[PDB]
RNA sequence: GUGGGAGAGGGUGGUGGAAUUCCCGGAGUAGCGGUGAAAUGCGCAGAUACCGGGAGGAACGCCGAUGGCGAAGGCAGCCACCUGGUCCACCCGUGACGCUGAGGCGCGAAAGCGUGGGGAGCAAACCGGAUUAGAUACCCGGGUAGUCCACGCCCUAAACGAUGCGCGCUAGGUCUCUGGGUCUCCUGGGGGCCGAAGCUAACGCGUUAAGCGCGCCGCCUGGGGAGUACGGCCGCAAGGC
């Protein structure tokens, strides 16, 4: 169970239009992952959160998903 | 807000000599600019309180600096009060 | 005055005539509020993560402007008045803070 | 009088009862069942056994419309929410996908005192 | 002064999705709900469960922290505007301009009052169902004020760190938020946990002092009567000082 930041290159944390990368920080559900899972900084995570929320309002990322299997 | 430009014009106005920044004069003038900005902002937004405390504080400072000028050089003081339209 | 980014998501059902019309109105309103246009990216048709106005898709216009700051909210109000425009988000620009440098 | 074949199954499970609604691909119900649908009356409705019986009853009722496949959707936490799905699996209905759709708010409404 | 920074600090306007309720439609029947058990209640005028559409109010899941901001009360969806405080670097300007602060003035959770809006959910009072010796309660079904907005009052609190403000001084270690640096680590500014010397009745405190000192304000002088009586002041009232 590696960390999200671990596998990735240089990427803008303020860029809400980039779904490809932002989707990696979400849950099985729509949830924004804990820092333990994102391996991010305090500041970093604080920025990512607002950027993701922007993308949600913007229609790009989900607010919620449905749990499969179960 | 207050642009760097506006600030600068205020200082090169109230400077006692080229390169003067922190004079009693320049300080009072700057404060005055900030005061007027705030009061104009508090005419609308009357319910902004925390800001208003900010203003109280500014006014207090301005008055103390003026009190100092008054004590030290009454002429510079009279001149300032006339130039700025205060007290 | 200040530097912003205009996000616009409009109806994916549009043909070219009507698309160009809505765009013509976006432009008109932009230059009408005093907004200068630095850069524009048209991403277009995209799959939304959730349905918007009952549509699974949306068409994206992205602008970057310099406009008078006292006029921004009026500008956005203007863009929203349109029927065909289902999302408007205007954001102050920011330096590209990044990780994994 | 339908012949639906492929279909959708909803398990709504609370602490007080379990109810199972079988519908078609569009989502309109075909049949339904519950702990009270069968003989049970009181607390016994929120029994897991009850939930089994209910799931089963609904699955047979749906067998009448000749259902084969089903898509399971589970809302709620409750005693024997699981036993519902379990019985539904061995019910002879071949279960395609299970999913948990339990609604949760982003904090809209003040809950009842028993719930705060 | 100049150049950087972090933030649910404030005010205004917009706006997004989840959920609840209600309404319209489809499909579908005999129950749902609820409890320790129940009952009241709702359901054949078709409820519950399910799908689609709409209206409305309120609050913002994850992120979220032993985190951050504010003088306090207190502040958390997203966007823009208006605005307060504050920290760091440079060592540039003024030249003691400082601290505290009786009175005054302003702010001040909730509940509460006034006028007008609004009203989904919750819910004092109230109406019921249970339980019980009784039940004026706990539990269950309803439900009005209220909770929400504007403007104006009220001025309270376990308004708590139960610790007034400022400055200097007196081992360290450890975790953390936010600057700067030759970024092993050093160095500022917050938040925490152990602990030197010391203090303390003890518990504990210990560079975020409850240590060593200086300055100024507030306050205490056995328990009950009593935050009562009286007088004054304030309040529309409740009531407050
Ligand atoms: Mg529109
Ligand atoms: Mg029951
Ligand atoms: Mg600055
Ligand atoms: Mg804020
Ligand atoms: Mg109906
Ligand atoms: Mg009836
Ligand atoms: Mg009846
Ligand atoms: Mg009847
Ligand atoms: Mg519906
Ligand atoms: Mg209504
Ligand atoms: Mg949490
Ligand atoms: Mg700001
Ligand atoms: Mg500021
Ligand atoms: Mg010097
Ligand atoms: Mg000199
Ligand atoms: Mg003071
Ligand atoms: Mg108050
Ligand atoms: Mg109140
Ligand atoms: Mg009222
Ligand atoms: Mg009223
Ligand atoms: Mg009740
Ligand atoms: Mg009673
Ligand atoms: Mg009785
Ligand atoms: Mg008894
Ligand atoms: Mg109720
Ligand atoms: Mg009344
Ligand atoms: Mg006290
Ligand atoms: Mg003392
Ligand atoms: Mg650093
Ligand atoms: Mg603080
Ligand atoms: Mg420290
Ligand atoms: Mg420490
Ligand atoms: Mg200690
Ligand atoms: Mg110290
Ligand atoms: Mg000290
Ligand atoms: Mg006595
Ligand atoms: Mg009293
Ligand atoms: Mg007397
Ligand atoms: Mg009296
Ligand atoms: Mg009177
Ligand atoms: Mg009283």
Domain boundaries, chain D: 1-116
User: Which phi and psi (to 5°) does residue D78 adopt?
Assistant: -175, 160
What is the resolution of the experimental data for this entry, in Å? 3.4
- Tell whether C48 lies on the interface with A, counting CB pairs under 8 A: yes
Q: CA torsion angle for D39, D42, D44, D46 (degrees, to 10)?
A: 110
Are residues C50 and A63 in contact, defined by beta-carbon separation less than 8 angstroms?
Answer: yes
Structure tokens at B41: 């902002």
Numbers of helices and strands, H then E, in chain A: 3, 2
Report the half-sphere exposure of C88 (CA within 13 A, side-chain side).
Answer: 16
- Tell whether A21 lies on the interface with C, counting CB pairs under 8 A: no
Structure tokens at B29: 């003038």
**Which stretches of chain A are assigned E, i.e. beta strand?**
11-12, 67-68
Q: Is chain B adjacent to chain A, meaning 3+ CB pairs within 8 angstroms? A: no
Structure tokens at C46: 């995209």
Instruction: Using the mean position of ligand 21's atoms as its centre, give its distance from the Cα of residue D112 in Å.
Output: 8
Ligand nearest A43 Cα, by number? 29
Distance separating alpha carbons of residues C45 and D104, to the nearest angstrom: 31
Report the half-sphere exposure of B23 (CA within 13 A, side-chain side).
Answer: 21
Distance separating alpha carbons of residues A19 and A61, to the nearest angstrom: 7
Q: How far is CA A23 from each of CA A32, A33, C36, rounded to the nearest angstrom? A: 9, 10, 33
CATH no., domain D1-116: 3.30.420.80
User: Which of C45, C74, C49 has the alpha carbon at shortest distance from C61?
Assistant: C45
Buried b (16+ CB within 10 A) or exposed e, B17-44: eeeeeebbbbbbbbbbbbbeebeeebee
Residue range of the domain that includes C7: 1-101
Give residues with Cβ within 8 angstroms of C1, minimum separation 6. Answer: C34, C66, C67, C68, C69
Looking only at the bridges linking them, the beta strands covering A11-12 and D94-100 are unpaired
- Tell whether A65 lies on the interface with C, counting CB pairs under 8 A: no
CA closest to C1' of E20 belongs to D109
User: Which phi and psi (to 5°) does residue A24 adopt?
Assistant: -65, -20
Q: DSSP 3-state assignment of D114?
A: helix
Q: Which helix (H) or strand (E) holds D98?
A: strand D94-100
Distance separating alpha carbons of residues B14 and B17, to the nearest angstrom: 9
Are residues D20 and D9 in contact, defined by beta-carbon separation less than 8 angstroms?
Answer: yes
Looking only at the bridges linking them, the beta strands covering C2-10 and C55-67 are antiparallel
Distance separating alpha carbons of residues A24 and A41, to the nearest angstrom: 16
Nucleotides of E under 7 A from a protein CB: 1-3, 6-20, 26-39, 48-53, 57-65, 67, 70-73, 77-85, 92-94, 96-98, 106-108, 120-123, 139-141, 151-152, 176-179
Domain count, chain C: 1
Structure tokens at C61: 């216009």
Q: Do D97 and A68 touch (CB under 8 A)?
A: yes
3-state secondary structure B11-78: HHHHCCCCCCCCCHHHHHHHHHHHHHHHHHHHHCCCCCCHHHHHHHHHHHHHHHHHHHHHHHCHHHHH
Give the determination technique.
X-ray
Structure tokens at A51: 């950027």
Residue of C nearest to A40 (CA): C99
Distance separating alpha carbons of residues A48 and A41, to the nearest angstrom: 10
State the DSSP code for A26: B
So what CATH class is B1-87?
Answer: mainly alpha
Domain count, chain A: 1
Name the one residue in this structure whose structure tokens are 């019309």: C21
Are residues C6 and C36 in contact, defined by beta-carbon separation less than 8 angstroms?
Answer: no
Q: How far is CA A56 from each of CA B31, C66, D92, rounded to the nearest angstrom? A: 43, 25, 41
C contacts of A61 (beta carbons < 8 Å): 49
Name the one residue in this structure whose structure tokens are 């749906």: D62
Instruction: Using the mean position of ligand 33's atoms as its centre, give its distance from the Cα of residue A41 in Å.
Output: 30
Name the one residue in this structure whose structure tokens are 């980014």: C5
D contacts of A69 (beta carbons < 8 Å): 98
Q: CATH number for the domain including A14?
A: 4.10.640.10
Helix axes B74-84, B24-43, angle to 10 degrees: 30
Q: DSSP 3-state assignment of B59?
A: helix
Distance separating alpha carbons of residues D80 and D13, to the nearest angstrom: 8
Q: How far is C62 from chain A (nearest CA, A)?
A: 10
Q: CATH number for the domain including C11?
A: 3.30.70.60
């Amino acid at each position: 169970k590696a960390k999200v930041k671990a596998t990735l290159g240089e990427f803008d944390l303020r860029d809400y239009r980039n779904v490809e990368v932002l989707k990696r920080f979400l849950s099985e559900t729509g949830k924004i992952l804990p820092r333990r899972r994102t391996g991010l900084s305090a500041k970093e995570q604080r920025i990512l959160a607002k950027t993701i929320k922007r993308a949600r309002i913007l229609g790009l990322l989900p607010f919620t998903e449905k749990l499969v299997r179960k | 807000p207050i642009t760097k430009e506006e600030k600068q014009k205020v200082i090169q106005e109230f400077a006692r000599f080229p390169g003067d920044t922190g004079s009693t004069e320049v300080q009072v003038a700057l404060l005055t600019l900030r005061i007027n900005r705030l009061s104009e902002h508090l005419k609308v937004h009357k319910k902004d309180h925390h800001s208003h405390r900010g203003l109280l504080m500014m006014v207090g400072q301005r008055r103390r600096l003026l009190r100092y000028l008054q004590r030290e050089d009454p002429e510079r003081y009279r001149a300032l009060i006339e130039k700025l339209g205060i007290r | 005055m200040r530097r912003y980014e205009v996000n616009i998501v409009l109806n994916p059902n549009l043909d070219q005539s009507q698309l160009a019309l809505e765009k013509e109105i976006i432009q008109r309103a932009l230059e009408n509020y005093g907004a200068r246009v630095e850069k524009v990216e048209e991403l277009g048709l995209r799959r939304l993560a959730y349905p918007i106005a009952k549509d699974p898709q949306g068409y994206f216009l992205w602008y970057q402007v310099e406009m008078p700051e006292d006029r921004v909210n009026d500008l956005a109000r203007e863009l929203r008045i349109r029927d065909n425009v289902r999302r408007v988000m205007v954001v102050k620009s920011q330096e590209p803070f990044l990780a994994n440098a | 009088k339908r012949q639906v074949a492929s279909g959708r199954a909803y398990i709504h499970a609370s602490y007080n009862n379990t109810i199972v609604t079988i519908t078609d691909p569009d989502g309109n119900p075909i049949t339904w069942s519950s702990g009270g649908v069968i003989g049970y009356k009181g607390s016994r409705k929120g029994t897991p056994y009850a939930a089994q019986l209910a799931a089963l009853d609904a699955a047979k009722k749906a067998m009448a419309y000749g259902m084969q496949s089903v898509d399971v959707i589970v809302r709620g936490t409750g005693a024997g929410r699981e036993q519902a799905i379990r019985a539904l699996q061995a019910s002879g209905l071949q279960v395609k996908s299970i999913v948990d759709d339990t609604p949760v708010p982003h904090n809209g409404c003040r809950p009842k005192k028993k719930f705060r």
